[PDB]
Write a protein that binds this DNA or RNA. Structure first.
Ligand SMILES: [K+]
Ligand SMILES: [K+]
Ligand SMILES: [K+]
Ligand SMILES: [K+]
Ligand SMILES: [K+]
Ligand SMILES: [K+]
Ligand SMILES: [K+]
Ligand SMILES: [K+]
Ligand SMILES: [K+]
Ligand SMILES: [K+]
Ligand SMILES: [K+]
Ligand SMILES: [K+]
Ligand SMILES: [Mg+2]
Ligand SMILES: [Mg+2]
Ligand SMILES: [Mg+2]
Ligand SMILES: [Mg+2]
Ligand SMILES: [Mg+2]
Ligand SMILES: [Mg+2]
Ligand SMILES: [Mg+2]
Ligand SMILES: [Mg+2]
Ligand SMILES: [Mg+2]
Ligand SMILES: [Mg+2]
Ligand SMILES: [Mg+2]
Ligand SMILES: [Mg+2]
Ligand SMILES: [Mg+2]
Ligand SMILES: [Mg+2]
Ligand SMILES: [Mg+2]
Ligand SMILES: [Mg+2]
Ligand SMILES: [Mg+2]
Ligand SMILES: [Mg+2]
Ligand SMILES: [Mg+2]
Ligand SMILES: [Mg+2]
Ligand SMILES: [Mg+2]
Ligand SMILES: [Mg+2]
Ligand SMILES: [Mg+2]
Ligand SMILES: [Mg+2]
Ligand SMILES: [Mg+2]
Ligand SMILES: [Mg+2]
Ligand SMILES: [Mg+2]
Ligand SMILES: [Mg+2]
Ligand SMILES: [Mg+2]
Ligand SMILES: [Mg+2]
Ligand SMILES: [Mg+2]
Ligand code: NA
Ligand SMILES: [Zn+2]
Lengths: 121, 114, 204, 123, 56
RNA sequence: ACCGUGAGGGAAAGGUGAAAAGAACCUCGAACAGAGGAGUGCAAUAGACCCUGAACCCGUCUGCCUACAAGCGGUAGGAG
RNA sequence: UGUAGGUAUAAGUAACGAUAAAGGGGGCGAGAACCCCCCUCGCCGAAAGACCAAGGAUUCCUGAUCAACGCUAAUCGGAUC
RNA sequence: AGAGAUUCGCGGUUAAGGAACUAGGCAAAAUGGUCCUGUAACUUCGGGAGAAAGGACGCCUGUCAGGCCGCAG
RNA sequence: GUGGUUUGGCACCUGAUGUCGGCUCGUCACAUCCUGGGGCUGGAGAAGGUCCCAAGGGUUGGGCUCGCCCAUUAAAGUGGCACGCGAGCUGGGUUCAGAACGUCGUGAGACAGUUCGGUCUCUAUCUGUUGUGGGCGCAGGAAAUUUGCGAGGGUCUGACACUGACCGUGUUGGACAGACCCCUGGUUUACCGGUUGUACCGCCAGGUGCACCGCCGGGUAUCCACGUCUGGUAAGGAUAAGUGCUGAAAGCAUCUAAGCACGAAGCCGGCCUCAAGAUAAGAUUUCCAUAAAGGGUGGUUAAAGACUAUGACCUUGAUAGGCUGCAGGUGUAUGAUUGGUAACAAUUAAGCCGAGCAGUACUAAUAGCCC
């Protein structure tokens, strides 16, 4: 459950470390974003000598969330942090690596390229 | 008569499983659908909570992958559970181990029973 | 058309393709035809049905005579239904096999009663101001109820505090999961209004 | 709402209510019949009969568990002696409540609660 | 907050229409022969439902 | 009297009966609390707050009207 | 927006003045939630315990009384004699 | 004395988020004890300073070491 | 020419008609922001421009204080209602007493100015509105099941795929609303456990009181949303703007005057709830006076409830409690063996609770009195 002014961990190898959620996309008065949802973010901190600069506005897709998520098979999954991966203008990954696990929900949302992660759960 | 009990018996699903408690370390084999070829995935971790009534119970298993804690809630009656194995028995002093979230490394260990 | 029924409770089942479903169990039970109404005598066509067997200790003499005319044992709950696809005589039995071919049903019941409730719970009013920042005593207050001296009145239909719940509610298009004629049981997907033990009308 | 909430608060805080119920239980055990308001007696009937059921197992454990409710040595002695001897072989329903009238000062509905085995005219 | 007019005697009496004193529920003692409150111990003789309850 | 530290300010309140002859005694009631009698007296609905005993205001009884009806409440018609 | 006295209306309504708390058994009595005795419970305890002074002026003790006073009743009282 | 509607007074807990509230972090939350380390710019050389920032804390046994219990000393 | 929403003119109402913006709650209009239907185009398609018909429903969150900016959305419309709404809120702004700067004045002081600080009273009588009862009537007395004169609600919309498109197609979300607690998540001063200080039960053990429920960890039923199901949809009929057929007046023409086809989220319906005090008081079945024909008062109570009202049961009774078993909460009590020098650990196996379910007359539910 991510909303405006939430803070997320950036889970790729682009220089961004943390992001602040500006907007949840996909409708008037849409409050919460879950795994697989597209959001607009602002970059809050970067590692030294990074491609993207601190303060840039980008798009991202949520890959980990602390609030538990229900699957149609009656099971649930939750993580210890809220983490997202940055996207360029076209909608491709800005980076080359993914750190930590990724929800299995990312498969149907045209993020099979994200699904090349250390573990899909 | 017991209509709810009759309904539960009529729709009973899943398989028998070995006894386990909170604090035990288990491995669950879960059937997943990777496009078309159905696969089996292994999830190993510590049971931190069991709740529910009878055969409609749910149990929560916690593991740590890449320094990120993951929790999964499974129904006991789930037809997607192929097998449950109890790797080790843990000794604890409470029903729900919610204190394990704020722990890592050797501070999150659980003493084995025997 | 339809029958009477009693809500038992809720459970969860797994469908054939491994989907967890929340189910409501309804004891539909045998309903007997207590009266037949006609266009030529009443002004419309309907079947009156009685549901739960009653002893003579709890049946008034007018009701007892009404049942004796139809040659049935006294019942506790009666209700009318319309548009039956067939002919049904006085004093005959209908069971939950009536719903065997049905895919979706409508359930009519009486919701649980909340008593007197304020505008926040009854109507989702936002509340006046914040919990702090100068709040005195209007945290759960309605606010303004009118527009000064030009109407100089409160309009009819203004949303206010009052009794909430304990009223007739319909839920439509509940999918039927299973029919058990050996136990007079009907399984539907979802929730029906009312508490356990309340009487329902199940429409095909 | 109070749907399926099954004890009377009796216009008191929790500690005061528990202390009053314990005192009333001790008074009923010592003097086999006491006079009180109807609502208090109906609460006491809920409170005190599981305490009398504990005397069907004369053990140190049951004595200590009963003392946890009572905290009264004389009440405990009388209860595990003569009261227990009298209420052996009765499967519950050890008490009886009979209404009597109203008080002058507040028009409170009055009654008395007694142990059924110490009244002789009521068989 | 304030009455614009004083109320007339008629208006006051119309409101007081529903002020009444409740009649007690009295039963007769078939044996003793006196009045007592129904579902209550008859205080004259101490009997209740044919059995002695309060011993004088 | 009361009010004010003080200088000071500053009320309300008359009438049994000619004569106390001011009601022994009885009944209800825990009690004169009060009343109903008896007795005194021209009179007690003169009984102690007592001559006379108005209005506003408050009751009971009797007669007529009144639960499909809408504004200064009356006025002029008019059945029962 | 006149003065004194009496009586209304709002109305059997607001309120009965710290959320430290009460329960039972006996006594007296025409009458008891509240008065007296006993048991249990709770509150204060650098006080809400014990003293000096200012100020008050019989409120102190006992017997009768429950009209008025006591924000209820009272057989009780710092109330009346 | 009952009863345990709305609403108000005084309090308690709260998933995910964490000032997005608001004129304003108002109110609340948080910090907080003893001992040991270690403390910047600036300065009127006294200060700033308890700056900041870290660590230990229960019970048992033995001349600080070993052991034991709990989510938490 | 229209309007009265800007700046004005007039001075007719006012022993107080008492305040800008924001919040809350709305309601109305259309001069239409989006969605729906059309005429024209200097309209090839694709989007655009302009005009007509149309007001049903919708019409975001922030950094700043009319307007600018950031990110979205189908869209982020314009106005009226004492510039809607302070006996509903706030008090940032504004009329007050303190103080300071600039400017003006000899001075007291003043200002198209600026700046820091600065009490928002009232127990709802009538009417209005939301709920809920008593009486009588219909009706000689009743128990039920109903028809619907009418009233209210509901009506939103995106993306994608197949055939730079017409049309047709399906697969799915966002928001909003209703119900519900199997699931997830909250509460849970019922309940269970750990632990600090202190007091008491000679001592100890075991408890208990108090310290915010002392603190801490859990937590069933109930109540809930952050959860789960369900819904909005088409157009049945008459139509608006427009498109046509046959056709005189006016031998030609003409969508029209007699006629006939279509054609909108708009109107009346379908759907949901209320509804015969609808005094036009409707209909159908059955029973009719006294015991339990119908009730009242009463009792045991409830998933019903402010009081009422309503539901179940009242002894040939499972209504509530207790009792006996379970589902379940908590987590291994007291003691005894067993090891340790101890703090402690293992077995015996737990104990306590059980608002839920099942069984059982032990307790309480007296047909007494009144229509
Ligand atoms: K008006
Ligand atoms: K209980
Ligand atoms: K005279
Ligand atoms: K004279
Ligand atoms: K007079
Ligand atoms: K007249
Ligand atoms: K005046
Ligand atoms: K005395
Ligand atoms: K205004
Ligand atoms: K309608
Ligand atoms: K539940
Ligand atoms: K619960
Ligand atoms: Mg209710
Ligand atoms: Mg709020
Ligand atoms: Mg204030
Ligand atoms: Mg307040
Ligand atoms: Mg209370
Ligand atoms: Mg306490
Ligand atoms: Mg009244
Ligand atoms: Mg007297
Ligand atoms: Mg005279
Ligand atoms: Mg006179
Ligand atoms: Mg009429
Ligand atoms: Mg009439
Ligand atoms: Mg005046
Ligand atoms: Mg009033
Ligand atoms: Mg006052
Ligand atoms: Mg009051
Ligand atoms: Mg002196
Ligand atoms: Mg004295
Ligand atoms: Mg008095
Ligand atoms: Mg004295
Ligand atoms: Mg929270
Ligand atoms: Mg949290
Ligand atoms: Mg802000
Ligand atoms: Mg804001
Ligand atoms: Mg502060
Ligand atoms: Mg003039
Ligand atoms: Mg005036
Ligand atoms: Mg106003
Ligand atoms: Mg000044
Ligand atoms: Mg200040
Ligand atoms: Mg849960
Ligand atoms: Na139970
Ligand atoms: Zn008798």
């Amino acid at each position: 459950m991510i909303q405006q002014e939430s803070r997320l961990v950036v889970a790729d190898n682009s220089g961004a470390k943390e992001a602040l959620c500006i907007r949840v996309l996909g409708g008037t008065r849409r409050r919460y974003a879950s795994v697989g949802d597209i959001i607009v973010v602002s970059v809050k901190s970067v590692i030294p000598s990074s491609d993207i600069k601190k303060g840039a506005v980008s798009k991202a897709v949520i890959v980990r969330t602390k609030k538990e998520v229900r699957r149609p098979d009656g099971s649930y999954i939750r993580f210890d942090d809220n983490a997202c991966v940055l996207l360029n203008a076209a909608g491709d990954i800005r980076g080359s690596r993914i750190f930590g696990p990724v929800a299995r929900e990312l498969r149907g949302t045209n993020m099979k390229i994200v699904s090349l992660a250390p573990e899909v759960l | 008569m017991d209509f709810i009990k009759i309904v539960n018996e009529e729709f009973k699903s899943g398989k028998e499983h070995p006894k386990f408690n909170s604090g035990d370390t288990i491995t669950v084999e879960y059937r997943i659908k990777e496009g078309n070829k159905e696969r089996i995935q292994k999830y190993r971790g510590v049971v931190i909570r069991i709740s529910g009534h009878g055969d409609k119970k749910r149990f929560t298993v916690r593991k740590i992958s890449d320094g990120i804690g993951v929790e999964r809630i499974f129904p006991i009656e789930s037809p997607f559970i192929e097998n449950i194995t109890v790797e080790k028995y843990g000794k604890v002093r409470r029903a729900k181990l919610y204190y394990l979230r704020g722990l890592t490394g050797k501070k999150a260990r659980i003493k084995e029973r025997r | 058309p339809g029958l009477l029924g009693k809500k038992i409770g809720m459970t969860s089942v797994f469908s054939a393709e491994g989907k967890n479903l929340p189910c409501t169990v309804i004891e539909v039970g045998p309903c007997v035809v207590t009266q037949v109404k006609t266009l030529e005598k009443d002004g419309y066509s309907a079947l009156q049905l009685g549901f739960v067997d009653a002893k003579e200790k709890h049946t008034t003499k007018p009701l007892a005579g009404h049942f004796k005319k139809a040659n049935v044992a006294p019942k506790r709950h009666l209700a009318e239904f319309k548009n039956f696809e067939g002919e049904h005589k006085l004093g005959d039995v209908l069971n939950v096999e009536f719903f065997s071919d049905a895919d979706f049903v409508d359930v009519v019941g009486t919701s649980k009663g909340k008593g007197f409730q304020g505008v926040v719970k009854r109507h989702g009013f936002g509340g006046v101001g914040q919990a702090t920042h100068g709040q005195h005593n209007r945290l759960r207050a309605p606010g303004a109820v009118g527009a000064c001296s030009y109407p100089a009145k409160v309009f009819k239909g203004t949303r206010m505090a009052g009794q909430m719940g304990n009223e007739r509610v319909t839920v439509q298009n509940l999918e039927v999961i299973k029919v058990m004629p050996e136990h007079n049981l009907l399984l539907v997907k979802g929730s029906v209004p009312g508490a356990k033990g309340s009487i329902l009308l199940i429409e095909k | 709402m109070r749907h399926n909430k099954k004890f009377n608060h009796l216009g008191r805080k929790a500690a005061h209510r528990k202390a009053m119920l314990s005192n009333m239980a001790a008074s009923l055990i010592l003097h086999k019949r006491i006079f009180t308001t109807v609502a208090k007696a109906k609460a006491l009937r809920i409170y005190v009969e599981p305490l009398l059921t504990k005397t069907k197992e004369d053990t140190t454990h049951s004595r200590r568990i009963a003392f946890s409710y009572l905290q009264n040595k004389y009440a405990l002695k009388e209860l595990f002696g003569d009261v227990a001897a009298k209420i052996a072989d009765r499967p519950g329903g050890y008490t009886r409540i009979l209404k009597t009238g109203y008080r002058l000062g507040d028009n409170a509905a009055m009654c008395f609660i007694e142990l059924v085995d110490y009244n002789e005219n009521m068989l | 907050a304030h009455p614009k007019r004083r109320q007339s005697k008629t208006r006051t009496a119309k409101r007081r229409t529903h002020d009444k004193a409740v009649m007690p529920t009295l039963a007769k003692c078939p044996n003793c022969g006196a009045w007592h409150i129904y579902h209550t111990v008859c205080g004259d003789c101490g009997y209740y439902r044919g059995k002695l309850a309060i011993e004088k």
